[PDB]
Design an enzyme around this catalytic site. Structure first.
Site, PDB file in Angstrom:
ATOM      1  N   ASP D  45     -23.711 -44.541  -2.293  1.00 58.44           N
ATOM      2  CA  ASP D  45     -22.491 -44.712  -3.078  1.00 58.44           C
ATOM      3  C   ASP D  45     -21.294 -44.147  -2.324  1.00 58.44           C
ATOM      4  O   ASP D  45     -20.197 -44.707  -2.375  1.00 58.44           O
ATOM      5  CB  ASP D  45     -22.618 -44.039  -4.445  1.00 58.44           C
ATOM      6  N   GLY D  46     -21.520 -43.043  -1.617  1.00 56.85           N
ATOM      7  CA  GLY D  46     -20.500 -42.438  -0.781  1.00 56.85           C
ATOM      8  C   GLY D  46     -20.014 -43.362   0.322  1.00 56.85           C
ATOM      9  O   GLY D  46     -18.812 -43.471   0.561  1.00 56.85           O
ATOM     10  N   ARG D 142      -5.412 -25.734 -20.921  1.00 57.01           N
ATOM     11  CA  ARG D 142      -5.568 -24.623 -19.995  1.00 57.01           C
ATOM     12  C   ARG D 142      -7.033 -24.445 -19.598  1.00 57.01           C
ATOM     13  O   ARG D 142      -7.872 -24.090 -20.424  1.00 57.01           O
ATOM     14  CB  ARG D 142      -5.012 -23.319 -20.573  1.00 57.01           C
ATOM     15  N   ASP D 144      -9.904 -25.315 -15.877  1.00 60.01           N
ATOM     16  CA  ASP D 144     -10.105 -25.560 -14.456  1.00 60.01           C
ATOM     17  C   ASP D 144      -9.434 -26.850 -14.004  1.00 60.01           C
ATOM     18  O   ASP D 144      -8.847 -26.906 -12.923  1.00 60.01           O
ATOM     19  CB  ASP D 144     -11.594 -25.581 -14.114  1.00 60.01           C
ATOM     20  N   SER D 152     -17.348 -47.516 -14.284  1.00 58.49           N
ATOM     21  CA  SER D 152     -18.480 -47.395 -13.369  1.00 58.49           C
ATOM     22  C   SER D 152     -18.589 -45.988 -12.785  1.00 58.49           C
ATOM     23  O   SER D 152     -19.647 -45.584 -12.298  1.00 58.49           O
ATOM     24  CB  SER D 152     -18.385 -48.430 -12.247  1.00 58.49           C
ATOM     25  N   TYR D 157     -19.096 -37.952 -11.596  1.00 66.25           N
ATOM     26  CA  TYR D 157     -18.495 -36.683 -12.000  1.00 66.25           C
ATOM     27  C   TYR D 157     -18.313 -36.604 -13.516  1.00 66.25           C
ATOM     28  O   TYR D 157     -18.678 -35.611 -14.145  1.00 66.25           O
ATOM     29  CB  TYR D 157     -17.150 -36.497 -11.305  1.00 66.25           C
ATOM     30  N   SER D 160     -21.296 -35.268 -15.376  1.00 63.45           N
ATOM     31  CA  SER D 160     -21.539 -33.831 -15.271  1.00 63.45           C
ATOM     32  C   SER D 160     -20.631 -33.040 -16.212  1.00 63.45           C
ATOM     33  O   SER D 160     -21.004 -31.975 -16.699  1.00 63.45           O
ATOM     34  CB  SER D 160     -21.341 -33.355 -13.834  1.00 63.45           C
TER      35      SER D 160
HETATM   36  N1  LIG Z   1     -20.518 -38.515  -2.095  1.00 66.10           N
HETATM   37  N2  LIG Z   1     -19.435 -38.782  -2.688  1.00 66.10           N
HETATM   38  N3  LIG Z   1     -18.347 -39.031  -3.296  1.00 66.10           N
HETATM   39  C1  LIG Z   1     -17.769 -37.987  -4.134  1.00 66.10           C
HETATM   40  C2  LIG Z   1     -18.167 -38.222  -5.579  1.00 66.10           C
HETATM   41  O1  LIG Z   1     -18.947 -37.123  -6.045  1.00 66.10           O
HETATM   42  C3  LIG Z   1     -18.737 -37.025  -7.485  1.00 66.10           C
HETATM   43  N4  LIG Z   1     -18.699 -35.594  -7.870  1.00 66.10           N
HETATM   44  C4  LIG Z   1     -17.861 -34.629  -7.508  1.00 66.10           C
HETATM   45 BR1  LIG Z   1     -16.364 -34.785  -6.401  1.00 66.10          BR
HETATM   46  N5  LIG Z   1     -18.206 -33.479  -8.050  1.00 66.10           N
HETATM   47  C5  LIG Z   1     -19.286 -33.699  -8.776  1.00 66.10           C
HETATM   48  C6  LIG Z   1     -20.083 -32.895  -9.566  1.00 66.10           C
HETATM   49  N6  LIG Z   1     -19.815 -31.615  -9.706  1.00 66.10           N
HETATM   50  N7  LIG Z   1     -21.122 -33.430 -10.179  1.00 66.10           N
HETATM   51  C7  LIG Z   1     -21.382 -34.702 -10.032  1.00 66.10           C
HETATM   52  N8  LIG Z   1     -20.654 -35.501  -9.294  1.00 66.10           N
HETATM   53  C8  LIG Z   1     -19.596 -35.029  -8.657  1.00 66.10           C
HETATM   54  C9  LIG Z   1     -17.519 -37.859  -7.782  1.00 66.10           C
HETATM   55  O2  LIG Z   1     -18.013 -39.079  -8.266  1.00 66.10           O
HETATM   56  C10 LIG Z   1     -16.917 -38.120  -6.425  1.00 66.10           C
HETATM   57  O3  LIG Z   1     -16.253 -39.371  -6.421  1.00 66.10           O
HETATM   58  N1  LIG Z   2      -5.814 -13.153 -16.960  1.00 71.20           N
HETATM   59  N2  LIG Z   2      -6.895 -12.885 -16.364  1.00 71.20           N
HETATM   60  N3  LIG Z   2      -7.987 -12.638 -15.763  1.00 71.20           N
HETATM   61  C1  LIG Z   2      -8.772 -13.762 -15.266  1.00 71.20           C
HETATM   62  C2  LIG Z   2      -9.860 -14.099 -16.267  1.00 71.20           C
HETATM   63  O1  LIG Z   2      -9.663 -15.422 -16.760  1.00 71.20           O
HETATM   64  C3  LIG Z   2     -10.973 -15.944 -17.132  1.00 71.20           C
HETATM   65  N4  LIG Z   2     -11.034 -17.384 -16.786  1.00 71.20           N
HETATM   66  C4  LIG Z   2     -10.937 -17.989 -15.607  1.00 71.20           C
HETATM   67 BR1  LIG Z   2     -10.744 -17.182 -13.932  1.00 71.20          BR
HETATM   68  N5  LIG Z   2     -11.004 -19.297 -15.742  1.00 71.20           N
HETATM   69  C5  LIG Z   2     -11.147 -19.549 -17.030  1.00 71.20           C
HETATM   70  C6  LIG Z   2     -11.276 -20.709 -17.766  1.00 71.20           C
HETATM   71  N6  LIG Z   2     -11.270 -21.883 -17.173  1.00 71.20           N
HETATM   72  N7  LIG Z   2     -11.406 -20.624 -19.077  1.00 71.20           N
HETATM   73  C7  LIG Z   2     -11.409 -19.453 -19.657  1.00 71.20           C
HETATM   74  N8  LIG Z   2     -11.290 -18.328 -19.000  1.00 71.20           N
HETATM   75  C8  LIG Z   2     -11.161 -18.343 -17.683  1.00 71.20           C
HETATM   76  C9  LIG Z   2     -11.980 -15.029 -16.488  1.00 71.20           C
HETATM   77  O2  LIG Z   2     -12.398 -14.160 -17.506  1.00 71.20           O
HETATM   78  C10 LIG Z   2     -11.164 -14.222 -15.510  1.00 71.20           C
HETATM   79  O3  LIG Z   2     -11.731 -12.933 -15.353  1.00 71.20           O
HETATM   80  N1  LIG Z   3     -20.279 -34.981  -4.085  1.00 69.71           N
HETATM   81  N2  LIG Z   3     -21.086 -35.455  -4.967  1.00 69.71           N
HETATM   82  N3  LIG Z   3     -21.877 -35.920  -5.834  1.00 69.71           N
HETATM   83  C1  LIG Z   3     -21.783 -37.341  -6.126  1.00 69.71           C
HETATM   84  C2  LIG Z   3     -23.158 -37.963  -6.157  1.00 69.71           C
HETATM   85  O1  LIG Z   3     -22.924 -38.973  -7.104  1.00 69.71           O
HETATM   86  C3  LIG Z   3     -23.483 -40.197  -6.658  1.00 69.71           C
HETATM   87  N4  LIG Z   3     -22.520 -41.194  -7.139  1.00 69.71           N
HETATM   88  C4  LIG Z   3     -21.407 -41.692  -6.618  1.00 69.71           C
HETATM   89 BR1  LIG Z   3     -20.630 -41.319  -4.950  1.00 69.71          BR
HETATM   90  N5  LIG Z   3     -20.874 -42.571  -7.433  1.00 69.71           N
HETATM   91  C5  LIG Z   3     -21.626 -42.626  -8.505  1.00 69.71           C
HETATM   92  C6  LIG Z   3     -21.564 -43.332  -9.672  1.00 69.71           C
HETATM   93  N6  LIG Z   3     -20.590 -44.165  -9.902  1.00 69.71           N
HETATM   94  N7  LIG Z   3     -22.509 -43.151 -10.579  1.00 69.71           N
HETATM   95  C7  LIG Z   3     -23.502 -42.316 -10.373  1.00 69.71           C
HETATM   96  N8  LIG Z   3     -23.603 -41.616  -9.275  1.00 69.71           N
HETATM   97  C8  LIG Z   3     -22.670 -41.753  -8.327  1.00 69.71           C
HETATM   98  C9  LIG Z   3     -23.801 -40.059  -5.183  1.00 69.71           C
HETATM   99  O2  LIG Z   3     -25.212 -40.155  -5.091  1.00 69.71           O
HETATM  100  C10 LIG Z   3     -23.385 -38.644  -4.821  1.00 69.71           C
HETATM  101  O3  LIG Z   3     -24.443 -37.984  -4.125  1.00 69.71           O
HETATM  102  N1  LIG Z   4      -6.921 -17.022 -16.400  1.00 68.94           N
HETATM  103  N2  LIG Z   4      -7.380 -17.035 -17.602  1.00 68.94           N
HETATM  104  N3  LIG Z   4      -7.831 -17.048 -18.780  1.00 68.94           N
HETATM  105  C1  LIG Z   4      -8.409 -15.814 -19.285  1.00 68.94           C
HETATM  106  C2  LIG Z   4      -7.898 -15.524 -20.676  1.00 68.94           C
HETATM  107  O1  LIG Z   4      -9.021 -14.856 -21.192  1.00 68.94           O
HETATM  108  C3  LIG Z   4      -8.614 -13.692 -21.890  1.00 68.94           C
HETATM  109  N4  LIG Z   4      -9.688 -12.737 -21.590  1.00 68.94           N
HETATM  110  C4  LIG Z   4      -9.879 -11.884 -20.594  1.00 68.94           C
HETATM  111 BR1  LIG Z   4      -8.755 -11.525 -19.132  1.00 68.94          BR
HETATM  112  N5  LIG Z   4     -11.006 -11.234 -20.757  1.00 68.94           N
HETATM  113  C5  LIG Z   4     -11.570 -11.685 -21.851  1.00 68.94           C
HETATM  114  C6  LIG Z   4     -12.737 -11.405 -22.502  1.00 68.94           C
HETATM  115  N6  LIG Z   4     -13.569 -10.517 -22.038  1.00 68.94           N
HETATM  116  N7  LIG Z   4     -13.020 -12.058 -23.617  1.00 68.94           N
HETATM  117  C7  LIG Z   4     -12.199 -12.960 -24.106  1.00 68.94           C
HETATM  118  N8  LIG Z   4     -11.073 -13.266 -23.518  1.00 68.94           N
HETATM  119  C8  LIG Z   4     -10.741 -12.641 -22.383  1.00 68.94           C
HETATM  120  C9  LIG Z   4      -7.176 -13.397 -21.519  1.00 68.94           C
HETATM  121  O2  LIG Z   4      -6.437 -13.560 -22.717  1.00 68.94           O
HETATM  122  C10 LIG Z   4      -6.785 -14.502 -20.552  1.00 68.94           C
HETATM  123  O3  LIG Z   4      -5.549 -15.094 -20.956  1.00 68.94           O
END
Ligand SMILES: [N-]=[N+]=NC[C@H]1O[C@@H](n2c(Br)nc3c(N)ncnc32)[C@H](O)[C@@H]1O
Ligand SMILES: [N-]=[N+]=NC[C@H]1O[C@@H](n2c(Br)nc3c(N)ncnc32)[C@H](O)[C@@H]1O
Ligand SMILES: [N-]=[N+]=NC[C@H]1O[C@@H](n2c(Br)nc3c(N)ncnc32)[C@H](O)[C@@H]1O
Ligand SMILES: [N-]=[N+]=NC[C@H]1O[C@@H](n2c(Br)nc3c(N)ncnc32)[C@H](O)[C@@H]1O
Ligand SMILES: [N-]=[N+]=NC[C@H]1O[C@@H](n2c(Br)nc3c(N)ncnc32)[C@H](O)[C@@H]1O
Ligand SMILES: [N-]=[N+]=NC[C@H]1O[C@@H](n2c(Br)nc3c(N)ncnc32)[C@H](O)[C@@H]1O
Ligand SMILES: [N-]=[N+]=NC[C@H]1O[C@@H](n2c(Br)nc3c(N)ncnc32)[C@H](O)[C@@H]1O
Ligand SMILES: [N-]=[N+]=NC[C@H]1O[C@@H](n2c(Br)nc3c(N)ncnc32)[C@H](O)[C@@H]1O
EC number: 2.7.1.23
Lengths: 257, 257, 257, 257
Positions: D45-46, D142, D144, D152, D157, D160
């Site tokens: 697929d890649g 808010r 990642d 398709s 991704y 997942s």
């Molecule tokens: N090999 N390749 N191509 C990269 C493809 O990996 C897939 N992919 C990525 Br980036 N992160 C992934 C993840 N955490 N889990 C599954 N698929 C992912 C997504 O479809 C991207 O287009």
């Molecule tokens: N502000 N601050 N401190 C950063 C804290 O945010 C939290 N955090 C991070 Br990094 N990403 C996060 C997410 N996507 N969702 C919730 N909390 C997260 C985690 O607890 C980290 O220690």
């Molecule tokens: N990086 N990464 N992970 C993406 C993994 O998703 C697979 N993949 C890709 Br690229 N496209 C895809 C799709 N449309 N559906 C399912 N798997 C896929 C491929 O095998 C690759 O190893």
């Molecule tokens: N970056 N980011 N997000 C992390 C958010 O998680 C909160 N947080 C942190 Br730092 N530690 C936490 C914890 N142990 N439990 C819940 N929330 C938390 C905080 O309010 C921050 O705004």
């Protein structure tokens, strides 16, 4: 006792900080930000994390306190208007301790302490690592990354990743996945995993050896990494308790209303 | 020692059962299914659950053993071909104990013990209950039901509901949701929740008072229920260990390959 | 036009109902609950579902309207205070149509129409069924049950089960799992599945042939079931539109604030 | 017809590539990697994604074919041993088309086409963006990052991240969340969202304006971004079909066994 106060830096926090210092100067309390016995954080959970990491070398000699100027935190769980009452009581209280997470990175070797979690992610490429639990190969993970959380850190990042919230009295650690690929080829457990003390979880690079590793706030790219070891720390963080604020009530207020 | 053996009932299990009895008759071992000291289950985790519940009144006087005729279980984790070796060793071994879950249903009042989990569901209608943790109202749940799992029961139903897998050495309990409605009106925590010993989780009916309650295999509709109390039991189940079969290796074999 | 009005039955709804009838009697509008051209539901999404199922035999001859006395619904999305304005406009408006889900149960054979979803669950025992998509065996499901949702029904039960919310203009159907067992033995897709028109999903009993089947509100145990067929219906429900209330704004108001 | 063949680069793929070229030279087929009418990808697929992006400017003039040397793909779904049979048939077949995702990045303005998905993540900091659907503010996210997937690309991704798998005949797009923070303060929909043609989803920076943006394989950090617009493309990718390999059978083989 010797004490110190950190601040979020905004207007409300510094002024609340100076007022507490002023009130502290009415008692037998020396301000010392080198060897304090009491550390007071003013701001949010974020400001508290920084406060912790600034004094991680004297954890068992410190009692922490968290005042939230903004919204209620899990570490910063004292209201501003309770500061004056807090000062009097500190002039003399019980201590509550929480488990910590030790992370070891080998190449030499660097050790860290986490209050919330440590995570591992890939450096601009596919993330693949072998997960080894107590020397037994458990799974080959392929996805965005993994997260190992302390009990008190489960309400944070761990929570967003689908992990369960666990009470801080439980000495454990929780591993959750970040977007794991699961097909006929790759297989991961999926469920979060909770480990007890003395269990060692080790992440080993499969092909690439460069990971973005995070411990709470600080996130640094590590090169030529050979292993990442996770296990519940022997050290604990100590809070100063002045009244009952149950963990589950702290969860309710933060998430339910 | 006094002993007994239960069987899945199929051909392979009864014949393996008679062979072990035959081999047991070569030693100083009396067969007694009233007051055994050793209980051997032959079949699956299901056959083991039944074996447990048949002798829940003498838990601290029994050591359990699980032989899987079919696929590897979490309780039935001895291979058939290891039965003969098992017999010799039992003729004299260490014991491993797992936490249990106590469920209390009030109307009188009935208490139960669970090895995997207890669940609560609605009787042909909308399920709404208030969740109270240690007397503090935590949330109003509206959905299909809830599940409270023992540590060893987390690989079962708990797992399907999104719960985390937790090591049996951790004395705890895990609550997971079943299809919770979440909008502006209704709000639940979502995340699974892990409670330590002595924490009491209580489910209280909002409008309807008739629930379908389950403890492991047995599921019975209870009427005029006023409360359901969940807390880690003071009693534990004791297994007989003859070699190392780590929990995390048992998880790997069952779920990864 | 001929019209009729159903009511949740509470005080606010009947009084709003009589006021609309009173205002309708000021125009050329005959009240007929046998062959109406306009059906007005007053209450909630629940009251609207009932209204739909009461007139499912004349769907293409009816235009539906939903007034919410309580909280905003997805079908009952007109505020009470807009009733008077609603009456005038109905005296003469555009129509918006939503896809429906056809369910077929074979033993004879019974067909149903669903506005939200149809689900299948087990009758006091383990639920195991084979899933066949367009005559190709896709998976053997073992869990609590399955749910097939219309586009507009995705914000309901489907949502709680982890399904995605899909815009009603898309003619499709969504299948989600209820607590599927996944180990080395049993394997299901996990992800929800969205099917286009003309795709037929068929559930076939493996051992037990008794299922609790639900179509929206109505839930009935069916015995000696041989097959359950799901496919997007050829029939559609028609709403009367008087202004812009986008589906995604309806989602925002209901779930975000 | 004019044609070309790309290869994963490993031994098996180049040799299969030269054999097809050799067999193609037995027919009226000119090899042209500038203006081909047929593009054959050999690898995974890649390798197919790369093949697509190499010829995205002549999509409606090309018919694509995917041969998997390794494991079965979703685009590379022809077995090596079918290559010779493939050659003959290409010497003259039906075409199947899949929807594409258009991404627009404004600062000037750059447009992209995606075959799987486009994602947005933060540049070494907290990711916060406002989600606007058809000019209506829907939520403040808010976490990642976010992921918008083609039909398709949902098996990739999107899968997942908890998204649903949708049949490629449905002209739509799916938005899923990456670790969204949800408390009393921040609120996101949680569920994946499926949009029809002509719906425009726009991501707007709240504080930071630097995002890591990805379109399939290619991932580039964009600075001073003011907006990211997602909508189903007007262009489609065309495959050459030589037999029946249903999408749902392709899903079964990849994920169930
Ligand atoms: N090999 N390749 N191509 C990269 C493809 O990996 C897939 N992919 C990525 Br980036 N992160 C992934 C993840 N955490 N889990 C599954 N698929 C992912 C997504 O479809 C991207 O287009
Ligand atoms: N502000 N601050 N401190 C950063 C804290 O945010 C939290 N955090 C991070 Br990094 N990403 C996060 C997410 N996507 N969702 C919730 N909390 C997260 C985690 O607890 C980290 O220690
Ligand atoms: N990086 N990464 N992970 C993406 C993994 O998703 C697979 N993949 C890709 Br690229 N496209 C895809 C799709 N449309 N559906 C399912 N798997 C896929 C491929 O095998 C690759 O190893
Ligand atoms: N970056 N980011 N997000 C992390 C958010 O998680 C909160 N947080 C942190 Br730092 N530690 C936490 C914890 N142990 N439990 C819940 N929330 C938390 C905080 O309010 C921050 O705004
Ligand atoms: N009914 N049902 N499903 C339960 C399935 O879970 C398995 N099982 C049981 Br019982 N207890 C279990 C446990 N503690 N962990 C994992 N699987 C278990 C058993 O194989 C059974 O087929
Ligand atoms: N066989 N057996 N015993 C019944 C066991 O099946 C497990 N179980 C039940 Br009930 N429903 C389940 C489900 N939907 N998925 C997995 N395990 C389940 C649970 O552990 C219960 O104790
Ligand atoms: N029983 N139950 N729960 C269903 C809840 O879903 C709501 N509801 C219904 Br009915 N249909 C719905 C729909 N299509 N979308 C969102 N919510 C809905 C309604 O408010 C009801 O209280
Ligand atoms: N009120 N009402 N009508 C019943 C509607 O509730 C919805 N529903 C049911 Br049943 N169970 C539900 C659940 N656990 N969560 C959310 N909605 C549900 C579904 O849409 C059904 O059509």
């Amino acid at each position: 006792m010797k004490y110190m106060i950190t601040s979020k830096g905004d207007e409300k926090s510094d002024l609340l900080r100076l007022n507490m210092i002023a009130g502290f100067g009415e008692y037998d309390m020396e301000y010392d930000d080198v060897e304090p016995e009491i550390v007071i954080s003013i701001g949010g959970d974020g400001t508290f994390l920084s406060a912790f990491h600034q004094y991680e070398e004297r954890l068992d000699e410190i009692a922490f306190i968290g005042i939230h100027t903004g919204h209620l935190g899990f570490y910063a769980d004292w209201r501003p208007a309770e500061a004056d009452k807090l000062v009097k009581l500190l002039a003399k209280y019980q201590k509550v301790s929480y488990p910590l997470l030790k992370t070891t990175v080998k190449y030499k070797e660097a050790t860290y302490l986490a209050l919330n979690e440590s995570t591992v992610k890939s450096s601009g490429g596919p993330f693949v690592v072998d997960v080894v639990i107590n020397d037994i190969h458990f799974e080959r993970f392929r996805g965005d990354g993994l997260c190992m959380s302390t009990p008190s850190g489960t309400t944070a990042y761990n929570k967003s990743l689908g992990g369960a919230l666990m009470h801080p009295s439980i000495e454990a650690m929780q591993l959750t996945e970040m977007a794991s690929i699961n097909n006929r080829v790759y297989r991961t457990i999926g469920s979060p995993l909770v480990f007890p003390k003395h269990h060692v979880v080790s992440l080993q690079p499969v092909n690439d050896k460069d990971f973005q590793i995070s411990v709470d706030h600080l996130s640094i790219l590590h090169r030529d990494v050979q292993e990442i070891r996770y296990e519940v720390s022997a050290k604990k963080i100590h809070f100063a308790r002045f009244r009952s604020f149950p963990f589950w009530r702290r969860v309710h207020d933060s998430f339910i209303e």
